[PDB]
Amino acid sequence: VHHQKLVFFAGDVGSNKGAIIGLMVGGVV
Amino acid sequence: VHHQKLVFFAGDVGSNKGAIIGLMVGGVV
Amino acid sequence: VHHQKLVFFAGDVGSNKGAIIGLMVGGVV
Amino acid sequence: EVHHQKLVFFAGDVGSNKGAIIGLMVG
Amino acid sequence: EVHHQKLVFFAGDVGSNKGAIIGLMVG
Amino acid sequence: EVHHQKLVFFAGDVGSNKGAIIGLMVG
Amino acid sequence: VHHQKLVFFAGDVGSNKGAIIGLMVGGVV
Amino acid sequence: VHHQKLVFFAGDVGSNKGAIIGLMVGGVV
Amino acid sequence: VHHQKLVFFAGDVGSNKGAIIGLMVGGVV
Amino acid sequence: EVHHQKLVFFAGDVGSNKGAIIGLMVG
Amino acid sequence: EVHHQKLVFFAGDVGSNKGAIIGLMVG
Amino acid sequence: EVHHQKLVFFAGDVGSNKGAIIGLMVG
């Protein structure tokens, strides 16, 4: 089982007001 | 089982107010 | 089993207020 | 048993409240 | 048993409250 | 038993409160 | 010759995002 | 010749984001 | 010839983010 | 002669500008 | 002659500017 | 002749500027 670079941003990210999650298994975001 | 670069952004991302998730298995976003 | 670059953005992304998910198996978004 | 909820209420303006507004009421 | 909740209430303006606004009420 | 909550209330302005605003009320 | 209480609010006004004008003779609102 | 109480609020006003004008003769609001 | 109490607030005013003008003859608001 | 204007542009979000956005251009 | 203007631009968010944004440009 | 202006630009957030943003440009 190999998980790598599941979300990849090659450029810039200006503003995050939401959620950025690699792997989401449980909980509330 | 090989998961790589499931969401890939080659350019810029201005603003995120929502969700960006690689792999979504459970929970509430 | 090989999952790669399931959602690919070659240009820019201005604003996300919704969901961008690579692979969606369970949960509520 | 009540668990794992997200609630997003009132994205715009609310003029007047003369009653009750309650997020979570238990019992 | 009540657990794991997120509540986001009133993203804009509220003019007037003359009643009750309660986040979490237990018992 | 009530546990693990996040509450975000009133992101904008509130003009006037003449009633009650309570975060968490126990008993 | 006598203008009085042309707009009368006996109760409460929650929010105004528009125009409330007594007497409108010229201009742009 | 007599202008009085052209806009009358007997109760409370919660929030104003617009215009409240007694008498509007010229200009831009 | 007599202008009096053109806008009258008998109760409270919570917040103003707009304009409250008695008499508007020229200009930009 | 150009006078007495009010301009309210872009009440929501703008994702991306790659061109020109100009309030007032004279000459 | 250009006079008496009010300009209210961009009430929400702007993600990315890669071009030009100019309030007032004279000549 | 350019006179008597009010400019209110960018009430929310700006993520990224890679270009130009100029209030007033004369000549």
Author numbering:
A (entry chain A), B (entry chain A), C (entry chain A), G (entry chain C), H (entry chain C), I (entry chain C): 12 to 40
D (entry chain B), E (entry chain B), F (entry chain B), J (entry chain D), K (entry chain D), L (entry chain D): 11 to 37
Could you pull the original sentences from the published paper?
The Arctic mutation, encoding E693G in the amyloid precursor protein (APP) gene [E22G in amyloid-β (Aβ)], causes dominantly inherited Alzheimer’s disease. In summary, we report the structures of Aβ filaments from a case of AD with the Arctic mutation and from mouse knock-in line AppNL−G−F. These findings have implications for our understanding of AD pathophysiology. Comparison of local conformations in this region revealed the presence of additional hydrogen bonds between adjacent Aβ molecules in mutant protofilaments; these hydrogen bonds cannot form in wild-type protofilaments, providing a plausible explanation for the increased fibrillogenesis of E22G Aβ. Mutation E22G may have an additional fibrillation-promoting effect, which is the relief of electrostatic repulsion as a result of removal of the negatively charged carboxylic group of E22; in the wild-type structure, E22 is trapped in close proximity to the carboxylic group of D23.
Most filaments, solved to 2.0 Å resolution, are made of four mutant protofilaments, with two copies each of non-identical protofilaments A and B. The ordered cores of protofilaments A and B, hereafter referred to as the human Arctic folds A and B, consist of residues V12–V40 and E11–G37, respectively. Each fold comprises four β-strands (β1–β4) that extend from residues 12 to 15, 18 to 21, 30 to 32 and 34 to 36 in fold A, and from residues 11 to 13, 14 to 19, 30 to 32 and 34 to 36 in fold B. Human Arctic fold A is almost identical to the fold of type II protofilaments of wild-type Aβ42, but it is shorter by two C-terminal amino acids. The substructures that are common to folds A and B form a dimeric and pseudo-symmetric interface that is centered on residues G25 and S26 from both folds and is stabilized by salt bridges between D23 from one fold and K28 from the other fold, and vice versa. These doublets of protofilaments A and B pack together with C2 symmetry to form the tetrameric filaments. The interface between doublets is also stabilized by two salt bridges, between the main chain carboxyl group of the C-terminal residue V40 from protofilament A in one doublet and the side chain of K16 from protofilament B in the other doublet, and vice versa. Our high-resolution cryo-EM maps of Aβ filaments with the Arctic mutation showed the absence of side chain densities at G22, unlike the corresponding maps for wild-type Aβ filaments. In the majority of filaments, half of the protofilaments (human Arctic fold A) are made of Aβ40, with the terminal carboxyl group of V40 contributing to the protofilament interface, whereas the other half (human Arctic fold B) may contain a variable number of residues after G37. In these dimeric filaments, the terminal carboxyl group of A42 contributes to the protofilament interface. These findings establish that the parenchymal deposits of E22G Aβ differ from those of wild-type Aβ by the presence of abundant Aβ40 filaments.
